[PDB]
Symmetry: D3
Subunit: 132 residues, 6 copies
């Protein structure tokens, strides 16, 4: 079950210098970087597309604002059961042992995005890496 | 925004794990608001801090240990600080938490964190009357 | 109180240089080394005994071939509730916070073995450390 | 044998969340905390006394303003050869392996202060811990 | 003295999963990523240009071969005294405290490249990031 | 390619620093070739290992400590292993090395590494006659 999955490293990661920490945890679980982009400021269209599912929620504009308030890294990762596993890795701000669990404490500012399903992954990879 | 009371226990000093513990709370973006180093804490304060436990078998050993070496009392502050730092503290069974990664005993478990809004307000008062 | 349990650092830990990482996690939880042996190559029958409850499975041969594909270390750890506590520490590749949860991503190449009960502990210790 | 020395964790360590990192390095070299105080804001005259040998320099005012720009922690560490050993640990922004060498990149915002002699140690301790 | 400098993360870093470790050390010394590229396999022309100074040494072909035997990351870093400081950080396989000092042990396979001068930096940044 | 002899000393076990030490040697890409755990080492072996020091004031305290707790003897292998692992060991003055980061005493200093090709061949023989 070899998969690719899309990871965004969010502006708060850069603010708090947790970028390598975050990538290191994914690296140590043996997943490989397939492609990678650094955006000093992400084009607002990309961000809007990326969180399209949310275009209606009341947190949509604040979220876009924040996602654009600093650098982000978009990463395509590959490995056995990648989508599911990098999601567990991402975790949530409640449970320790995870990226969010250990280093994040905000509903908006939570360091990392990881695709949550087979479809969202294909989608998200084409948004950030259109060249396939 | 919330505040909570953390105690670094004597085993933490014994085992040179003080920075490791504080570091974990630091990495989850919680901020120190007050801090005191007690080379040895007054048994009075301990018994207050653990007053709800005054009727248990373990009560006297607890206090004995709690005055067996230094402790640091810290007031932390951040969003949802009380329950998040509590989840961080964890227990000796759950790896990923402080106790889960570093502690192996029912008594010597490195850290105390307030477990409710009331406990916090009261414990803070105990350790930081001012 | 005190128990002793048997741990194996598997060949993948050597290949991936996670020997110290694994051992460090058991060390930071306050467990002590009572015995320890480094095997550049473990004799096959030791492996086969160690996994004897597993001899009828389909995976049995490949497992043994893997366990013989590089160095292993056998360690007897001692501590309160050591068997159960070191088992949780090992965890599984689905559980962030544990050894396999953070560092392994494979059904067979999962870094570490830990005894799962009092009897298997006593049995496994006598296999790697028969001189007692 | 035993010496005590005075350490300050400067405001930049709080802003950058390196308080535990700094203290950990001193802890891993086996030095012990004898006294310790957290100041959300250090009174200015304490800072000025602490840096009194520095009062005629051009940088004197900005230094003091910085030291007052956030929390600091004053710590008395005790250990063999503590004054000299903790000084080397602090190092400088040019020397990899030390605190400033790995984590600081600035003439003024350099994370940590350590006493540089027996006399300054005795003097600085009496400033932050006059109750003795 | 604000500077940009060019860093390459070499294939051995990917082999040994030290990528985030290496980047983390630069991050913790407070340098910022200005731009960044991931190359699954670097175009051999780029590598030849990058090590042009060496086109004559007997190690030139082996070096190119190795630089192309796996992924690399090219990074432009910014910060006070960046060229000089990231060079100290890089270090050499003899002295601990550095990236190479702590993690490398080969004259060829040494994890990281960092520009060593103001000119080599301008040059190397234009090779990998021609868009300026 | 070279081989060298490393001893993890009892203070390393006392202070729970065994993985930290081995980990540093592991990260510089050196490989374990033989390893033995001694719960307590025969004073005989120690005195051999430290035979060149048999005439110093510190000699008996040295041996006393060296048999005061467990030790691990390791044979490492890698390019230029003897001098590189020696540089890694360092001394209590030089931060960045093992002793420089973790040790603060002239006797209890966590680790021994062979310091020459001859010392290595001889020390290896001592700890791994086989
Ligand atoms: C629910 C929620 C999400 N967000 C942001 C942060 C989330 O990472 C992002 C997507 O929301 P969500 O899908 O809930 O989180 P996840 O990334 O774990 O799937 O939207 C807010 O800013 N406010 C909110 O109330
Ligand atoms: C249950 C129990 C607690 N204790 C001590 C350790 C605990 O930190 C303290 C309070 O107990 P408890 O509230 O059970 O644990 P926690 O600290 O997680 O709230 O009392 C013992 O010494 N022995 C025991 O059997
Ligand atoms: C279940 C399973 C295990 N194994 C190997 C890896 C396991 O570590 C070992 C023992 O299996 P198991 O008891 O399932 O895991 P563990 O005891 O380690 O928690 O057998 C396979 O190779 N294939 C398999 O399908
Ligand atoms: C030399 C210098 C120091 N400082 C500040 C930072 C130093 O930590 C502090 C004391 O100066 P100094 O004694 O040079 O450094 P330290 O004692 O910390 O090794 O004064 C400046 O702000 N500007 C300067 O030019
Ligand atoms: C000297 C030397 C360098 N190299 C490779 C590795 C070096 O990183 C690269 C450039 O050489 P050099 O300029 O000596 O190293 P640095 O990157 O520290 O400036 O060439 C060899 O493969 N063999 C050699 O003998
Ligand atoms: C010089 C000295 C060494 N020793 C011990 C610690 C050393 O590890 C051991 C050998 O000494 P030495 O060769 O000086 O140090 P190293 O271990 O770096 O080669 O003897 C003392 O106990 N006291 C002393 O004064
Ligand atoms: Mg979602
Ligand atoms: Mg309770
Ligand atoms: Mg089992
Ligand atoms: Mg000075
Ligand atoms: Mg050069
Ligand atoms: Mg010597």
């Amino acid at each position: 079950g070899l998969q690719r999955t899309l990871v965004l490293i969010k502006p708060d990661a850069f603010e708090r210098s947790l970028v390598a920490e975050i990538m290191g945890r994914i690296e140590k679980k043996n997943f490989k970087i397939v492609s990678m982009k650094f955006w000093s400021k992400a084009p607002r269209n990309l961000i809007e597309q990326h969180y399209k599912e949310h275009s209606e929620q009341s947190y949509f504009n604040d979220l876009c604002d924040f996602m654009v308030s600093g650098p982000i890294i978009s990463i395509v990762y590959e490995g056995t059961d990648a989508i599911s596993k990098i999601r567990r890795l991402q975790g949530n701000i409640l449970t320790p042992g995870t990226i969010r669990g250990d280093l994040a404490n905000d509903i908006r500012e939570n360091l990392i995005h990881a695709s949550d399903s087979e479809d969202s992954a294909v989608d998200e990879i084409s948004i950030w890496f259109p060249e396939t």
